Design a protein around this ligand. Sequence first.
Ligand SMILES: NC(=O)c1ccc[n+]([C@@H]2O[C@H](COP(=O)([O-])OP(=O)(O)OC[C@H]3O[C@@H](n4cnc5c(N)ncnc54)[C@H](OP(=O)(O)O)[C@@H]3O)[C@@H](O)[C@H]2O)c1
Ligand SMILES: NC(=O)c1ccc[n+]([C@@H]2O[C@H](COP(=O)([O-])OP(=O)(O)OC[C@H]3O[C@@H](n4cnc5c(N)ncnc54)[C@H](OP(=O)(O)O)[C@@H]3O)[C@@H](O)[C@H]2O)c1
Lengths: 263, 262
Amino acid sequence: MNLREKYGEWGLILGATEGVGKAFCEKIAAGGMNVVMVGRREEKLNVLAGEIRETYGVETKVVRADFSQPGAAETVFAATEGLDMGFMSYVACLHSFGKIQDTPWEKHEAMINVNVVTFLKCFHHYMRIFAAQDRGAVINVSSMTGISSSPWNGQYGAGKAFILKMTEAVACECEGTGVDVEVITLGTTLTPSLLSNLPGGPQGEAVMKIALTPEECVDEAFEKLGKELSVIAGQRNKDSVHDWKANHTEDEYIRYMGSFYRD
Amino acid sequence: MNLREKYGEWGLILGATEGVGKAFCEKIAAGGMNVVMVGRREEKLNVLAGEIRETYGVETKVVRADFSQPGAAETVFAATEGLDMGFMSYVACLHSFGKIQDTPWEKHEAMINVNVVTFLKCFHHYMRIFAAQDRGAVINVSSMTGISSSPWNGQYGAGKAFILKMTEAVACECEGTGVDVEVITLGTTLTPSLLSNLPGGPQGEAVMKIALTPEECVDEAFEKLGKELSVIAGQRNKDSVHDWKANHTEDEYIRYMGSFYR
Ligand SMILES: NC(=O)c1ccc[n+]([C@@H]2O[C@H](COP(=O)([O-])OP(=O)(O)OC[C@H]3O[C@@H](n4cnc5c(N)ncnc54)[C@H](OP(=O)(O)O)[C@@H]3O)[C@@H](O)[C@H]2O)c1
Ligand SMILES: NC(=O)c1ccc[n+]([C@@H]2O[C@H](COP(=O)([O-])OP(=O)(O)OC[C@H]3O[C@@H](n4cnc5c(N)ncnc54)[C@H](OP(=O)(O)O)[C@@H]3O)[C@@H](O)[C@H]2O)c1
């Protein structure tokens, strides 16, 4: 759970405001890092930043940026220049319900920006930094849809797959070096986004009981940092992926993922 | 009065490791029953068994068996010798996408074993036990495809319909006895991968009003045990099946199921 001496003074949470991003901010601060917190809700980030400073006694820097827009990465670069950087996590995602043809191009472009372009610009920039000082850590967040595909939300699984395989490559590249990289692939996790799908009564409560908390996802990711390259958070999600991979065709998995919308 | 007290010491979950089987294990344990958990993934069953014992304070027993293989049922029979049995649930299902001619006989034989032969061997054996002691319960699991049929995966519906109509018959036989039998027919069930493809919504909410968690399926089954013989889990699934049954022909339903493939 220690980060500051091993990796660096400051860690950067790209999509920090709530949910998994907030859990990352608390976790790195508990590990001795000062926190650069990036997100769209500047006021909410300021409130979080104050809680982090109070609870953990580290410094904070709030950066307002929207990863769906061109130049979001470059704004973050400017805001961190001069800091001793030790950690990055790409947490934000964007998805949008619809068949490929039913989603407008401007929405497709936004998803390319959040899940691919902003992602990679950040990953490249901070890897240049970490690799050059031979110390640093990256934990990027992927999704089980990056493994399964996401019918009726296609670009979501696509962009999370890009994150997954780019981070797996880099993780293997960093073994034996002072930089430690990992991708952690989430399933259902108790963030506001998730909670938005849940009807009030037992129809929602049943899901609460099988979802993971953001804290446990983050704790597992740090436990395995530097030892495992590609981790699926929670035993149940790991086992599920293995079962699909070992015992089913690719098409069986894909058709199963379409269950809500077809038969 | 709890399940243990009403039916017996041990329940047997045939296909226990995840999904609806896992939910049956947890549910009977919540009712005070000890759990015999049967499935292929032995180390995963051990983990689950540990969690159940810790959470609910009942005893557990893990049995490794593969219901696609001849001799699987006999392995389970041997494993429960001497236990006071009060419950059984057949949950395991095997299906394999393909037109009939494109699926090899060896896979067809495996499906017969899981959905029909191992199913009936176990149902017969434990009904002979339950009926002799005049005490026990059985909840078997079927699928919507047992109602609709499943073009391009014919044995799924076929096997699920065998389970459905067998269990319905026996459920009628067992009214007026100390054995309580029910079949529950399931639609879309929220398993770990499927859950992670929620749209956010409220398209997400809309999906969740129809799709059930395993826990919800099992809660409804126990709520209706000894009261209803054949249940369709979930209110919206009930509405859908009624609409199909009342306002469409059989061929319209089949052709809807086949309209995804070509
Ligand atoms: N929750 C789940 O069940 C689930 C399931 C599978 C995978 N995941 C993965 O977990 C991660 C978190 O996703 P989540 O949906 O649960 O949200 P989350 O943890 O709340 O995301 C953290 C924060 O990132 C920020 N963010 C989102 N879009 C952004 C943008 N364009 N620019 C800057 N910041 C942005 C949001 O705050 P602002 O609104 O203030 O910007 C959000 O609170 C994703 O990588 C996702 O693929 C989650
Ligand atoms: N829940 C998941 O993570 C998961 C993963 C892959 C696929 N699926 C899909 O979801 C459905 C299966 O759901 P499910 O696994 O969640 O639970 P389920 O249908 O409630 O089945 C309960 C359990 O029965 C066991 N079983 C299946 N075949 C068996 C056999 N031949 N002998 C003995 N036990 C057997 C399986 O565990 P063992 O494998 O340990 O035998 C399975 O977990 C299928 O349509 C499958 O395509 C789900």
